[PDB]
PDB file of C-alpha atoms and ligand atoms in Angstrom:
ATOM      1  CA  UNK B   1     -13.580  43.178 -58.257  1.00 57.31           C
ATOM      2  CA  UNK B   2     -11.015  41.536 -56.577  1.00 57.41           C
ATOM      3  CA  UNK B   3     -10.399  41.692 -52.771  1.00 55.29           C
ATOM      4  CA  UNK B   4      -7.413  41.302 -50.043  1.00 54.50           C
ATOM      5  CA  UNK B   5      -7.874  39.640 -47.555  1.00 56.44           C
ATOM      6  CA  UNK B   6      -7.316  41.309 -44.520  1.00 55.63           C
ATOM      7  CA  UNK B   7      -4.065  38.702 -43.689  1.00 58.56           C
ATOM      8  CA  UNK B   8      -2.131  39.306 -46.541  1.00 55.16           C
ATOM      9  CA  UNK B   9      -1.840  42.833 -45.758  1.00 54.00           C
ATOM     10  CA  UNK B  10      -1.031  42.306 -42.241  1.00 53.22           C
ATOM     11  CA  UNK B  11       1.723  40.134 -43.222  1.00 51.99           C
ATOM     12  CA  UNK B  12       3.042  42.850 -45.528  1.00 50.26           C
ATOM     13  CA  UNK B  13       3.070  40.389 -48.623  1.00 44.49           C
ATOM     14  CA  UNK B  14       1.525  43.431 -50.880  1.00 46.13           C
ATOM     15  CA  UNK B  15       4.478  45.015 -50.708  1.00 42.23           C
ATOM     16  CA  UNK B  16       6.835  42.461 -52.397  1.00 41.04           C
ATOM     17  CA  UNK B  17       3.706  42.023 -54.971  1.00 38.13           C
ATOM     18  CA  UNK B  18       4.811  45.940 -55.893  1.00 41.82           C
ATOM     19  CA  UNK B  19       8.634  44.579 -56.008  1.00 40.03           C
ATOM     20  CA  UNK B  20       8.033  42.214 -58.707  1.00 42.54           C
ATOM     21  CA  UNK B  21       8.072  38.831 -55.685  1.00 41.71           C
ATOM     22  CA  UNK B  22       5.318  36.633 -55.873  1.00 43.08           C
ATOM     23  CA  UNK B  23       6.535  33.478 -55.600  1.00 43.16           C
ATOM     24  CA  UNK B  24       6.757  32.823 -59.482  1.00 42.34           C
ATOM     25  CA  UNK B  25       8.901  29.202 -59.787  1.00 43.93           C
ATOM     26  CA  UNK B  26       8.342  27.897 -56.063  1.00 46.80           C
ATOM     27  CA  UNK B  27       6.568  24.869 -55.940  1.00 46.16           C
ATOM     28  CA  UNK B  28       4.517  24.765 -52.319  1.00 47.63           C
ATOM     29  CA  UNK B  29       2.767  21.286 -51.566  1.00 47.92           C
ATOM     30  CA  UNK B  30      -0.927  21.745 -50.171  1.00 45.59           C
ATOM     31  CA  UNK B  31      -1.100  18.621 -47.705  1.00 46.49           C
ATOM     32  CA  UNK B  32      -4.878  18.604 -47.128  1.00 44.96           C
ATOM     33  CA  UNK B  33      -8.309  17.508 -48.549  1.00 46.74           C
ATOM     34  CA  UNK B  34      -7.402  18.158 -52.146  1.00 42.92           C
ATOM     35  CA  UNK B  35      -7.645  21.679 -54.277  1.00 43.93           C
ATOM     36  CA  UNK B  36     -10.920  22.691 -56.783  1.00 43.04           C
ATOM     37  CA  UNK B  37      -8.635  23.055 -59.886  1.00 42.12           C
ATOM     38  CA  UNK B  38     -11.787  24.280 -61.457  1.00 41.71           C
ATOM     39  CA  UNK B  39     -12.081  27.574 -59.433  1.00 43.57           C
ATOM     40  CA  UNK B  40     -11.608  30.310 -60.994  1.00 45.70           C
ATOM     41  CA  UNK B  41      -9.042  32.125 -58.880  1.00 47.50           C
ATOM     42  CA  UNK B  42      -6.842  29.092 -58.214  1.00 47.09           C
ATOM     43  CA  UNK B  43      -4.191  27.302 -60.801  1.00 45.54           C
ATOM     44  CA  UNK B  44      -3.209  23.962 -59.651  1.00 45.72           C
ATOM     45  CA  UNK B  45      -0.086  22.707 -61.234  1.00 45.01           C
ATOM     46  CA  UNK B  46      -0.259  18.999 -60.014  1.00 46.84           C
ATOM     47  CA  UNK B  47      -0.610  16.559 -57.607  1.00 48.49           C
ATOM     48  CA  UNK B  48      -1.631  13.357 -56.168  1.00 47.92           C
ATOM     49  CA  UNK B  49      -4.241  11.391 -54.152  1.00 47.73           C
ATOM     50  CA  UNK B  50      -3.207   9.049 -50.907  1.00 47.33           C
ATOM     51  CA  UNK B  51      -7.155   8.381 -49.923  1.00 48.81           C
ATOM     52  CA  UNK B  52      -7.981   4.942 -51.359  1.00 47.18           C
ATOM     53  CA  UNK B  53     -11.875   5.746 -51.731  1.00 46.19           C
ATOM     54  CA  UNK B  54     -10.993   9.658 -53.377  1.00 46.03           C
ATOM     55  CA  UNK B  55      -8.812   9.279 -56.142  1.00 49.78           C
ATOM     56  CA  UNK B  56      -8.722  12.264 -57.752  1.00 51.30           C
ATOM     57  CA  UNK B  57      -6.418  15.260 -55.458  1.00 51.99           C
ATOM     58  CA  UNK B  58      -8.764  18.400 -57.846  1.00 49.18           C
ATOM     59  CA  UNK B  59     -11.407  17.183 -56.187  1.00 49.20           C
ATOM     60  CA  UNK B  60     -12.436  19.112 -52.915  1.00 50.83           C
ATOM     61  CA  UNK B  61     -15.316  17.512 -51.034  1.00 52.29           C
ATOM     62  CA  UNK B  62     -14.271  18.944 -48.214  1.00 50.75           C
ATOM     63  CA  UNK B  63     -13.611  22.269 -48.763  1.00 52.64           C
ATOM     64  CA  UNK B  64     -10.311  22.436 -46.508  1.00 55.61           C
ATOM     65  CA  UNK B  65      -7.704  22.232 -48.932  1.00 56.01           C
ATOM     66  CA  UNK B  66      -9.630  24.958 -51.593  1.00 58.13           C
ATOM     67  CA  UNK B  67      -9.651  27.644 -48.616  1.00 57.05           C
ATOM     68  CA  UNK B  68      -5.843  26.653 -47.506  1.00 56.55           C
ATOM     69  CA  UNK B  69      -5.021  27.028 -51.246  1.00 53.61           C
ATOM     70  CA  UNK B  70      -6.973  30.582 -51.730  1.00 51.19           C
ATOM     71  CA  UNK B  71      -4.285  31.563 -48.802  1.00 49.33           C
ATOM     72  CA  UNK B  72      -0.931  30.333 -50.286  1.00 48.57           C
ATOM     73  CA  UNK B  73      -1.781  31.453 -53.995  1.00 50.02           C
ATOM     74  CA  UNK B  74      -5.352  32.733 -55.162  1.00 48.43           C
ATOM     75  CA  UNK B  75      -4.321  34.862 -58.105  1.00 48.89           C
ATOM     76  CA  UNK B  76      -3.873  38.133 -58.841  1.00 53.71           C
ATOM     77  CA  UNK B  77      -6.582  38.954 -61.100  1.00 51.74           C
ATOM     78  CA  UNK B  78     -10.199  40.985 -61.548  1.00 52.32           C
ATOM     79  CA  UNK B  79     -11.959  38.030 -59.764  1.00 49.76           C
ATOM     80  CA  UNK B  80     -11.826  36.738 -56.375  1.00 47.47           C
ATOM     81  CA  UNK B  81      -9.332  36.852 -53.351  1.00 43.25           C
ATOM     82  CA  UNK B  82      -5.514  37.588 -53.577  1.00 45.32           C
ATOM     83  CA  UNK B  83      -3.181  34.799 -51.860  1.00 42.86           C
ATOM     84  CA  UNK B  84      -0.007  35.394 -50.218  1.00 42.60           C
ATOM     85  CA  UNK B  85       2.381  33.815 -53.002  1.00 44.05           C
ATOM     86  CA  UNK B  86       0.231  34.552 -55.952  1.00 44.33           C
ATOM     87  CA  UNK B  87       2.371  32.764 -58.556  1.00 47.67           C
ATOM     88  CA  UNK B  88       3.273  29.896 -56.811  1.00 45.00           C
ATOM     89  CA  UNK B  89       3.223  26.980 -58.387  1.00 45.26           C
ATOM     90  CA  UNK B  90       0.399  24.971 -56.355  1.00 43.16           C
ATOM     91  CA  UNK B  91       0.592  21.498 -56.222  1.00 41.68           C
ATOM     92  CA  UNK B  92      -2.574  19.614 -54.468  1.00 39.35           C
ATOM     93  CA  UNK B  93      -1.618  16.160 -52.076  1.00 45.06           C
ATOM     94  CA  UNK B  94      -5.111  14.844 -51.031  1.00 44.72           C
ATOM     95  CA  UNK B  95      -4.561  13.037 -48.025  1.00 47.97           C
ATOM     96  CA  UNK B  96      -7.674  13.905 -45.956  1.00 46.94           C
ATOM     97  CA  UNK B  97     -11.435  13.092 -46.934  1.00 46.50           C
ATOM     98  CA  UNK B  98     -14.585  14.608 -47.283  1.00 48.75           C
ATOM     99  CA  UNK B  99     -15.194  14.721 -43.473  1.00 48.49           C
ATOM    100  CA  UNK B 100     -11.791  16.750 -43.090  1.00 47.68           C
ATOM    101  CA  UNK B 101     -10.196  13.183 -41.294  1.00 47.33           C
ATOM    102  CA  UNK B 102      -7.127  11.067 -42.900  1.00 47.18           C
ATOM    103  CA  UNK B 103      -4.877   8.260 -41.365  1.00 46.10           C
ATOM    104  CA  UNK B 104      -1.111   8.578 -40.752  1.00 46.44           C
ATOM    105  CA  UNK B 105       0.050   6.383 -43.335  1.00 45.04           C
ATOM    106  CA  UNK B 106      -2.230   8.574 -45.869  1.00 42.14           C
ATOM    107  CA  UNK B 107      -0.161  11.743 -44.409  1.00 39.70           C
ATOM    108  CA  UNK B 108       2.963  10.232 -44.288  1.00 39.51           C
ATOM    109  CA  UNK B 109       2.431   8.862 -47.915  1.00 39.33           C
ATOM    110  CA  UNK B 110       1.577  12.651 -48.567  1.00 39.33           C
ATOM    111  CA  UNK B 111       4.838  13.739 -47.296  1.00 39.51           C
ATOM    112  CA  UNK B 112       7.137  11.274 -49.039  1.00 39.42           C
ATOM    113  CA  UNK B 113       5.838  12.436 -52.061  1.00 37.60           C
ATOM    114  CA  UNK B 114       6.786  15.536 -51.571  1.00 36.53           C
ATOM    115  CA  UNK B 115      10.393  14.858 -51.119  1.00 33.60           C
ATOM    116  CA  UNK B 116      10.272  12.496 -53.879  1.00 33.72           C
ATOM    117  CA  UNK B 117       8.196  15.423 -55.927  1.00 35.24           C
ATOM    118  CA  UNK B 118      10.925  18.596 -55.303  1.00 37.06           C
ATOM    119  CA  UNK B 119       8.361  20.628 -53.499  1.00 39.15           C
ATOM    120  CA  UNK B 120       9.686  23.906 -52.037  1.00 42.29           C
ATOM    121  CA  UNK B 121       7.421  23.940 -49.361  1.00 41.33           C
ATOM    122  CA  UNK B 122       4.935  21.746 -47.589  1.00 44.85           C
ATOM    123  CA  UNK B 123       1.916  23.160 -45.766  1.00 41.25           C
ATOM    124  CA  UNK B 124      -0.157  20.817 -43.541  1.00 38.16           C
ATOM    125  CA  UNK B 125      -2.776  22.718 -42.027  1.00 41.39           C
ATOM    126  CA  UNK B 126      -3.965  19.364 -39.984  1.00 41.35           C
ATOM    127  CA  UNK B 127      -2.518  17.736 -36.976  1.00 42.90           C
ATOM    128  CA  UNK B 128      -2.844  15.297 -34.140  1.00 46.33           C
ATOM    129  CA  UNK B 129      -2.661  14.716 -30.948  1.00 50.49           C
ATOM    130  CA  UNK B 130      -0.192  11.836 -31.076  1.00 51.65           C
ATOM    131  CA  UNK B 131       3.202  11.389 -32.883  1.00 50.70           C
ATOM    132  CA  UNK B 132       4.781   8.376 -34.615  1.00 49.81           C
ATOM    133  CA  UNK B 133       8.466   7.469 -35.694  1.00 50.15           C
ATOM    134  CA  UNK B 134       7.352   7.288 -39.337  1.00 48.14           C
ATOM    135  CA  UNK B 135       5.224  10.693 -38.962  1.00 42.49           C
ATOM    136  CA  UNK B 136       9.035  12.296 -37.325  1.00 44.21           C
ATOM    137  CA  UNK B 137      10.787  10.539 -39.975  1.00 45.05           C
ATOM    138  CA  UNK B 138       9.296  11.805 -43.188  1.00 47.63           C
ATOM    139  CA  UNK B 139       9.362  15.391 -42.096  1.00 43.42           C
ATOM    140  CA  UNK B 140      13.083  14.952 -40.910  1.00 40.36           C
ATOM    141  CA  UNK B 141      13.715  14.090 -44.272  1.00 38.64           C
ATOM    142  CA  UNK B 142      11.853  16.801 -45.862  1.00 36.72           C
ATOM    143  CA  UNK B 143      13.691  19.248 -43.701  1.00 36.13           C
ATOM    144  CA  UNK B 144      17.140  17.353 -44.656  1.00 35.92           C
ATOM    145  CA  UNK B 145      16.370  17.501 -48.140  1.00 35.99           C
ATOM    146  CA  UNK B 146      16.000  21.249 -47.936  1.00 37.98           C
ATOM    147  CA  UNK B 147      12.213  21.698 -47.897  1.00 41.48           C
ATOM    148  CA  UNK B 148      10.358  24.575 -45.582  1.00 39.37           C
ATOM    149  CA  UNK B 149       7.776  22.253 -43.920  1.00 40.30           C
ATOM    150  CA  UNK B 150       5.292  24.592 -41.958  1.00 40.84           C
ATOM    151  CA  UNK B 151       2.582  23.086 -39.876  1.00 40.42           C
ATOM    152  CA  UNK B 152      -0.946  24.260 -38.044  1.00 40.64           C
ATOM    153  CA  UNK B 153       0.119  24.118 -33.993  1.00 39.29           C
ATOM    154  CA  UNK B 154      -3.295  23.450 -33.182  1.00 37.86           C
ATOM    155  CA  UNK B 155      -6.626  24.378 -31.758  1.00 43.10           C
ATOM    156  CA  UNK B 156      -6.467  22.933 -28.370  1.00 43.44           C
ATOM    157  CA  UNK B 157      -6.320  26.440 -26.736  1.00 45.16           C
ATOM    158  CA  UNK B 158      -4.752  26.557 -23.134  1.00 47.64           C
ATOM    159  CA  UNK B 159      -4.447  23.376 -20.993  1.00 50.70           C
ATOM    160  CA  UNK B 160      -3.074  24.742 -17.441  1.00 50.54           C
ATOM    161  CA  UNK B 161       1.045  24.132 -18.113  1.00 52.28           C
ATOM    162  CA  UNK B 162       1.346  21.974 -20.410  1.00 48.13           C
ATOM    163  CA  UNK B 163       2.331  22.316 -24.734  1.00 47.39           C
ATOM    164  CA  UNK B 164      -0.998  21.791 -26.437  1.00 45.58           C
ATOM    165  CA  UNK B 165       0.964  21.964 -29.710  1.00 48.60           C
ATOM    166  CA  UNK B 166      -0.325  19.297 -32.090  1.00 48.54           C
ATOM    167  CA  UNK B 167       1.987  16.602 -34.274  1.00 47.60           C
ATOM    168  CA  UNK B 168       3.518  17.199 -36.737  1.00 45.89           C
ATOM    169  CA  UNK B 169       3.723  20.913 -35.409  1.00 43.89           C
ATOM    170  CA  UNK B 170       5.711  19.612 -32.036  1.00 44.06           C
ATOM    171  CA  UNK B 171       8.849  17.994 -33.938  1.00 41.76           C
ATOM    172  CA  UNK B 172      11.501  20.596 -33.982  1.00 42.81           C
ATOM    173  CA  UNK B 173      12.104  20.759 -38.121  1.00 45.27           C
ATOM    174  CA  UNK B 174       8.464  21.933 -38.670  1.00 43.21           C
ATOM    175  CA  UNK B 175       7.718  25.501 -38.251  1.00 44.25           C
ATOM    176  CA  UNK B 176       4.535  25.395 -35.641  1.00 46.24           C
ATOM    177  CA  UNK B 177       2.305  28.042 -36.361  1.00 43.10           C
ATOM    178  CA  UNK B 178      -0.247  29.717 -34.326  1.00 43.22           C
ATOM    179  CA  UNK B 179      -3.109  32.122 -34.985  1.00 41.73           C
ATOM    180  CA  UNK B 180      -3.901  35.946 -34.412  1.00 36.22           C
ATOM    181  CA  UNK B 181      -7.049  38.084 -35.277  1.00 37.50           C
ATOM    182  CA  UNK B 182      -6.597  41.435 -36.795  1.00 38.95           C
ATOM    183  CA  UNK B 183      -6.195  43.259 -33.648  1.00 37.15           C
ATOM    184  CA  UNK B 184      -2.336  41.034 -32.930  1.00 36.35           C
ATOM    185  CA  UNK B 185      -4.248  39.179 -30.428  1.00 34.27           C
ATOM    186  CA  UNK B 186      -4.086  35.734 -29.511  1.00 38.07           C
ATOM    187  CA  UNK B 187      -7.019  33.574 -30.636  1.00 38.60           C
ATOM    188  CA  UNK B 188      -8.502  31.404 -27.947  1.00 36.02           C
ATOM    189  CA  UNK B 189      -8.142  28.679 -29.868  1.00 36.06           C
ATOM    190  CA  UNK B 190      -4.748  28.952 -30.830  1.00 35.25           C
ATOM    191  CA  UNK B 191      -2.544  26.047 -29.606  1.00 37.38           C
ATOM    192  CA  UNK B 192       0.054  26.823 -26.740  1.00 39.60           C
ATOM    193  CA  UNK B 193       3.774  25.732 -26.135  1.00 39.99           C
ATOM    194  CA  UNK B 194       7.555  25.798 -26.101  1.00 39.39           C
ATOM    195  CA  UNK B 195       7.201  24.302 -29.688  1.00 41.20           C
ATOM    196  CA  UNK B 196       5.011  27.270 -30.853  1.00 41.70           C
ATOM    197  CA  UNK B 197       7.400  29.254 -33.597  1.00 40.84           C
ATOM    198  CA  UNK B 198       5.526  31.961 -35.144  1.00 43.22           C
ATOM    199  CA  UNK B 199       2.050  33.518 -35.301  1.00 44.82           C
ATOM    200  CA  UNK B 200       0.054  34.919 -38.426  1.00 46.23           C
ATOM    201  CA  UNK B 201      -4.042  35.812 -39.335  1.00 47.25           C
ATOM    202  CA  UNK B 202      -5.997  32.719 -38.191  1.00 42.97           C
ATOM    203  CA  UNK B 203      -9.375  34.358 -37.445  1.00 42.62           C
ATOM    204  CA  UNK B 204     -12.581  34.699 -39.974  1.00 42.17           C
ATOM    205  CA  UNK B 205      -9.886  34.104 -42.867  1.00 42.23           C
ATOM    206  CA  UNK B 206     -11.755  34.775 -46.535  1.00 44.31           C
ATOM    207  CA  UNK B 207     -10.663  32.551 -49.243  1.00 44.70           C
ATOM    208  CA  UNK B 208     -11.614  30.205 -51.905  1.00 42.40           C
ATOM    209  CA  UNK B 209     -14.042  27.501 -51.628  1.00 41.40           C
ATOM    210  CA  UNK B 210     -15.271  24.705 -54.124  1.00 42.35           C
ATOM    211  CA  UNK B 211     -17.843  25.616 -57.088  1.00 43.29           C
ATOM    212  CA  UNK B 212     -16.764  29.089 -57.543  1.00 43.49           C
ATOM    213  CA  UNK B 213     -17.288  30.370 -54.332  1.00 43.41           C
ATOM    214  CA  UNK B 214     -15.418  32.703 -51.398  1.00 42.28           C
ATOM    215  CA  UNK B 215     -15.702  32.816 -47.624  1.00 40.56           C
ATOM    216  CA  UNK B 216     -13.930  32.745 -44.111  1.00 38.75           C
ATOM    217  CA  UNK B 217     -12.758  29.869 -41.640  1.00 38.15           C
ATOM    218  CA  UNK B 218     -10.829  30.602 -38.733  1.00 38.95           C
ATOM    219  CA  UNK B 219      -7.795  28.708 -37.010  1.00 39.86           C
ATOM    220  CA  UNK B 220      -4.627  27.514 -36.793  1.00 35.57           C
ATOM    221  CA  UNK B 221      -5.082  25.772 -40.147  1.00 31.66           C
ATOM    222  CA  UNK B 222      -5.626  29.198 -41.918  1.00 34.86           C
ATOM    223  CA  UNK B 223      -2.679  31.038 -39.855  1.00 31.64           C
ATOM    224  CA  UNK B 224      -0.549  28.300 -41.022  1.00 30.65           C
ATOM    225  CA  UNK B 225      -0.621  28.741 -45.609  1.00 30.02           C
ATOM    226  CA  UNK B 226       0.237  32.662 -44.412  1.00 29.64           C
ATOM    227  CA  UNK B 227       3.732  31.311 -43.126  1.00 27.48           C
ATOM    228  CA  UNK B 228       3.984  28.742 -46.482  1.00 29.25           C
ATOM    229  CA  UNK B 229       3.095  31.587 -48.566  1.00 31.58           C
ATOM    230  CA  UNK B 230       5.491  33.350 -46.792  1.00 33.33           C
ATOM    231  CA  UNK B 231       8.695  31.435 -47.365  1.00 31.61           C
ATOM    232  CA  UNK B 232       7.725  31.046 -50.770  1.00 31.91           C
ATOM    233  CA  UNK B 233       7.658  35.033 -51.313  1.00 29.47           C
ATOM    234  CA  UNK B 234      11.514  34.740 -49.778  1.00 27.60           C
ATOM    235  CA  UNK B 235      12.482  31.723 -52.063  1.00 26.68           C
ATOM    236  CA  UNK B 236      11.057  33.890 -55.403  1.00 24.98           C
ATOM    237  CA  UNK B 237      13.649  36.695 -54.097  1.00 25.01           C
ATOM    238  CA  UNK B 238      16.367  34.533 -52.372  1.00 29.01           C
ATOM    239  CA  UNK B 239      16.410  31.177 -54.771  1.00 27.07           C
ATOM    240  CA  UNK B 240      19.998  30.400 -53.621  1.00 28.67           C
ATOM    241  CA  UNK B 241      18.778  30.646 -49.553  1.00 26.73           C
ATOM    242  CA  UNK B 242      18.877  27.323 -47.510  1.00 27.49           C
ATOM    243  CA  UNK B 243      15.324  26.018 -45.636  1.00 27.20           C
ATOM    244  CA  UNK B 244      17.537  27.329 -42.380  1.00 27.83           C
ATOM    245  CA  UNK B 245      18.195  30.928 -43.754  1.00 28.67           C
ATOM    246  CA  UNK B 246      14.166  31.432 -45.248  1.00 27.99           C
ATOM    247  CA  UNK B 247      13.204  30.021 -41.503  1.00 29.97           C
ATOM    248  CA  UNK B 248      15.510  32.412 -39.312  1.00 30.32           C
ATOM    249  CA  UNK B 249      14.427  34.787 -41.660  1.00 28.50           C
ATOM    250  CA  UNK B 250      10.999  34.756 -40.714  1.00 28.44           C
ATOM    251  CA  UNK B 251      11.383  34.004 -36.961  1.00 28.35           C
ATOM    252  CA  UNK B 252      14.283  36.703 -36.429  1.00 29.81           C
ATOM    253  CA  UNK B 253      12.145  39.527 -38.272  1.00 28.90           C
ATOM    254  CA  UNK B 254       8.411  38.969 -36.515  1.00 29.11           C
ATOM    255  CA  UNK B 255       7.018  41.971 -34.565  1.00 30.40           C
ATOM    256  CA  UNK B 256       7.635  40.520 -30.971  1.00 30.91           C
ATOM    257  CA  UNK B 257       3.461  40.209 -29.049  1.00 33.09           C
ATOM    258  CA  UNK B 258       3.892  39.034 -25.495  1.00 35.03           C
ATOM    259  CA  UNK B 259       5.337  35.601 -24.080  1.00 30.38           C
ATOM    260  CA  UNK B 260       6.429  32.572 -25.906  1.00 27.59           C
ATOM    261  CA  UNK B 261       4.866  29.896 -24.548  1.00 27.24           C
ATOM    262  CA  UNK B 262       1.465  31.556 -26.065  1.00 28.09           C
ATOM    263  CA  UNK B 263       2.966  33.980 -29.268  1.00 25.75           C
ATOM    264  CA  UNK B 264       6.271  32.121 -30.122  1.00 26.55           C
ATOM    265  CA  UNK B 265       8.771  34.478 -31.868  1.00 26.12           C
ATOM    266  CA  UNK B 266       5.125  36.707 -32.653  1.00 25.44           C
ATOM    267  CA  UNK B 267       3.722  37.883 -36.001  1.00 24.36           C
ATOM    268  CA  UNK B 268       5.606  37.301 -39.387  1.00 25.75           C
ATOM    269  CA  UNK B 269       6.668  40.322 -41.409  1.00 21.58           C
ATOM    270  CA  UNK B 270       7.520  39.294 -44.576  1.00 21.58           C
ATOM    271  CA  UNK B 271       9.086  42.484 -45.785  1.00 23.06           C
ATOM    272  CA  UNK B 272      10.893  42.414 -42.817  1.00 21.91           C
ATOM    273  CA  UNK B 273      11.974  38.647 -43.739  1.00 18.58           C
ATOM    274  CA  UNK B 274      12.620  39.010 -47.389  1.00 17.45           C
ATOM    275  CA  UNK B 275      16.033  41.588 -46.847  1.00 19.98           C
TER     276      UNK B 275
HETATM  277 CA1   CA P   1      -8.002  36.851 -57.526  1.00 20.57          CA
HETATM  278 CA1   CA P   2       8.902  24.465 -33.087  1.00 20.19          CA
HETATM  279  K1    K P   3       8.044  22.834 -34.319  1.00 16.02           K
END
């Protein structure tokens, strides 16, 4: 039997499923500890490896990138979980290792190869506290070269007044993302700020893991492949629409939660966002 996750219904992704939009011909980028290509519900179309001691990207020792994946596009089968963008063409850039930690220049390799690649979308479900002209540079580019890049805020919860919004989530072409339980409510952990854009289901998140296996994670970094499988939903129905149009899209349709600073624009509706 296959299940949905919670998430994807709250999002209102099953009903463009019904519609025929699934994100069939969008390519989305999964910038993270690599993808299982050898589970079950996940088909991985490609990829590429920027860690110099783990070569191969369908190779998940970390089991980051597998769960981030499930979210985007676990497929619509008998078996498993259902992702977001269920058709999307899922393309694994291993830039973190096993113990879920990369450097910049393994990110920012990540990134470039994206552009260079013709990825729809980028997801990085990571971030840092610190930014770097290089790190601002690359996803400039991507943005410039009409890719959706959508980023994890952060976990960093509440820090008196001050953004606690992670990099690359702060820079202004990313879409920050933020997480929510099931209830519309804030997680603790969610990351707070001016730069905070949109918020989606971050909180005990079941997806795919490594040697044929399913189960939950919660944060930011699970909130985040909602939003990617999001705009790649739009792009399967709206294949002429600009990065700009699928990203006002989203943020001009959300069902408004309370302030800002902690919510951003609120919740994603991608029914809502699809016209
Ligand atoms: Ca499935
Ligand atoms: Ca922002
Ligand atoms: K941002």
């Amino acid at each position: 039997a296959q299940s949905v996750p919670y998430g994807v219904s709250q999002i209102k992704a099953p009903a463009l499923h019904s519609q025929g939009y699934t994100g069939s011909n969008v390519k989305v980028a999964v910038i993270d500890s690599g993808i299982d290509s050898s589970h079950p519900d996940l088909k991985v179309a490609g990829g590429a490896s920027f860690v110099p001691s783990e070569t191969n990207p369908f190779q998940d020792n970390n089991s980051h990138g597998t769960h981030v994946a499930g979210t985007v596009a676990a497929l619509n089968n008998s078996i498993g979980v259902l992702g977001v963008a269920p058709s999307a063409s899922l393309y694994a850039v291993k830039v973190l290792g096993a113990d879920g930690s990369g450097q910049y220049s393994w990110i920012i390799n990540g990134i470039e190869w994206a552009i260079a690649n013709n990825m729809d979308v980028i997801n990085m479900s990571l971030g840092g506290p610190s930014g770097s002209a290089a790190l601002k540079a690359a996803v400039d580019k991507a943005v410039a070269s009409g890719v959706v890049v959508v980023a994890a805020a952060g976990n960093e919860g509440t820090s008196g007044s001050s953004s606690t919004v992670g990099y690359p989530g702060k820079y202004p072409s990313v879409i920050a993302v933020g997480a929510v339980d099931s209830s519309n409510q804030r997680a603790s952990f969610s990351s707070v700020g001016p730069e905070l854009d949109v918020m989606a289901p971050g909180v005990s998140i079941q997806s795919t893991l490594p040697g044929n296996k399913y189960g939950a994670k919660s944060g930011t970094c699970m909130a985040s492949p909602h939003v990617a499988g999001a705009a790649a939903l739009i792009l399967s129905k709206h294949p002429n629409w600009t990065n700009t149009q699928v990203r006002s899209s989203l943020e001009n349709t959300t069902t408004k939660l309370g302030d800002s600073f902690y919510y951003g624009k609120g919740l994603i509706n991608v029914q809502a966002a699809a016209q």
